[PDB]
Amino acid sequence: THSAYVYQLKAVPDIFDEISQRFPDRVALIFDQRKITYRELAEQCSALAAVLQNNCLIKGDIVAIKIERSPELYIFMLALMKIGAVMVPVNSNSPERYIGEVLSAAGARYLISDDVTSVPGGAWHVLSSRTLIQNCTQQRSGNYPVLSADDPALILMTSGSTGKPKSVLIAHRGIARLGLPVPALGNSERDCYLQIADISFAASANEIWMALLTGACLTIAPPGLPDLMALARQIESDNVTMLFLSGGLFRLFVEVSVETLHIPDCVVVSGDFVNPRLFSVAVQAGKAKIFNGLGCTENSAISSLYHIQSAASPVPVGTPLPLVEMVVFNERLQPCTCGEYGELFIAGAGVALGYSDPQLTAERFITIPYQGTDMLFYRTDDRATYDQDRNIVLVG
Ligand SMILES: Nc1ncnc2c1ncn2[C@@H]1O[C@H](CNS(=O)(=O)NC(=O)c2cccc(O)c2)[C@@H](O)[C@H]1O
Numbered sequence: 001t002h003s004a005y006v007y008q009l010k011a012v013p014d015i016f017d018e019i020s021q022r023f024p025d026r027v028a029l030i031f032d033q034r035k036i037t038y039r040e041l042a043e044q045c046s047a048l049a050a051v052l053q054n055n056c057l058i059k060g061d062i063v064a065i066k067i068e069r070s071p072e073l074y075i076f077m078l079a080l081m082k083i084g085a086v087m088v089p090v091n092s093n094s095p096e097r098y099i100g101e102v103l104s105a106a107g108a109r110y111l112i113s114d115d116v117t118s119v120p121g122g123a124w125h126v127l128s129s130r131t132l133i134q135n136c137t138q139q140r141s142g143n144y145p146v147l148s149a150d151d152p153a154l155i156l157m158t159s160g161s162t163g164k165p166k167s168v169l170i171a172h173r174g175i176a177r178l179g180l181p182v183p184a185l186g187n188s189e190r191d192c193y194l195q196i197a198d199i200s201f202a203a204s205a206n207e208i209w210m211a212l213l214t215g216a217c218l219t220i221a222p223p224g225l226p227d228l229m230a231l232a233r234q235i236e237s238d239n240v241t242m243l244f245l246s247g248g249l250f251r252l253f254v255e256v257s258v259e260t261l262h263i264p265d266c267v268v269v270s271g272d273f274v275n276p277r278l279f280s281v282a283v284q285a286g287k288a289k290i291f292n293g294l295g296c297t298e299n300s301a302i303s304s305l306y307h308i309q310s311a312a313s314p315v316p317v318g319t320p321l322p323l324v325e326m327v328v329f330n331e332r333l334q335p336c337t338c339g340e341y342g343e344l345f346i347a348g349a350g351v352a353l354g355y356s357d358p359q360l361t362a363e364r365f366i367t368i369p370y371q372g373t374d375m376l377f378y379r380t381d382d383r384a385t386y387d388q389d390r391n392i393v394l395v396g
């Protein structure tokens with residue numbers, strides 16, 4: 001099925017199967033000089049999924065992943081999606097104490113890891129990603145679940161503005177929406193993305209799933225902390241065209257090698273306020289399209305984009321991605337006028353299933369009649385308003 005009804009989204013493995021069948025000879029993954037086509041990637045995902053099912057992993061099992069950046073990492077993500085497991089990606093750069101707190105808060109039953117020696121002990125059962133990969137047979141025949149867009153796919157950790165920790169349950173639809181080409185970016189199967197954001201952060205979905213659910217290429221940064229010299233060579237040598245950056249990596253690049261930012265076609269800076277002067281230096285250094293991007297864990301992935309063009313307050317966060325609705329509501333749950341201040345609320349395909357805390361879920365996921373639809377909204381706790389062109393601007 002390849003439906004032209006853009007709102008009708010499938011579960012992640014179904015979109016990938018469609019993409020891998022349509023672009024089987026396109027390159028899906030690049031690590032160093034190892035390159036993997038969609039055809040080979042789909043074969044490895046099927047074989048691993050069969051292995052995972054024969055290790056009694058089933059739909060709804062909470063499975064943590066601690067695998068350094070590598071092609072195997074993304075083969076495991078796809079295979080766990082195909083069996084309907086709920087992934088809990090773990091920061092490989094985090095101390096063992098914190099990882100155990102993550103897995104206990106997530107309710108992880110299993111921990112798949114590429115280094116079973118450096119993992120915390122607990123109620124979860126540790127599985128070796130290396131031994132699972134070794135056991136992959138040429139037969140990938142399996143009886144897999146019929147997954148829907150609303151089935152859970154991921155558990156990601158986040159914090160509120162005042163530091164309270166929250167466990168967010170993300171549905172397949174929240175990352176499956178990234179298979180829809182974003183008109184602001186003009187992306188397609190011809191693009192190439194750079195995987196640098198840690199898998200424990202929702203921003204990593206921007207890179208992983210916009211690539212693999214569109215037929216584009218994902219080139220994988222080396223594991224560990226960012227090496228800007230290697231990243232610059234990698235951006236050039238693999239022809240990265242869609243570059244997603246945190247505020248730290250963007251600022252550092254503006255300060256030490258701004259020209260690197262103009263090798264890609266589009267550069268998206270998300271995660272926090274950015275000094276507007278940094279945008280002005282970047283915009284004036286080349287013809288790449290530089291965007292201020294808004295995302296939240298509770299909306300799955302990148303949610304809004306604002307293209308910076310000129311010199312003429314914080315930069316707006318712009319207009320929502322496909323299937324995302326953003327509304328600034330005042331204290332009476334009324335849409336705000338231009339210049340009126342309120343709180344940003346987000347609705348549509350990205351909205352998470354909720355928190356592990358049911359009382360917090362009911363506070364922050366509320367249903368509001370809006371434009372004829374009883375719409376489920378996530379309350380961002382971000383103060384905001386509209387500008388003259390209806391662009392959304394967060395004002396902190
Ligand atoms: N351009 C921006 N300007 C100003 N403030 C921004 C911002 N972007 C985020 N914030 C703040 O961060 C909160 C959420 N942070 S998060 O860690 O939960 N998830 C992510 O950042 C994330 C998730 C998916 C994709 C992606 O690209 C990033 C949000 O509510 C705001 O306060």
Ligand SMILES: [Br-]
Pocket residue numbers: 247251273274275278
């Ligand atoms: Br900054």
Ligand SMILES: [Cl-]
Pocket residue numbers: 022023024025026
């Ligand atoms: Cl092809």
Ligand SMILES: [Cl-]
Pocket residue numbers: 095096097098
């Ligand atoms: Cl520790």
Ligand SMILES: [Cl-]
Pocket residue numbers: 165166167168355356357360
């Ligand atoms: Cl929670």
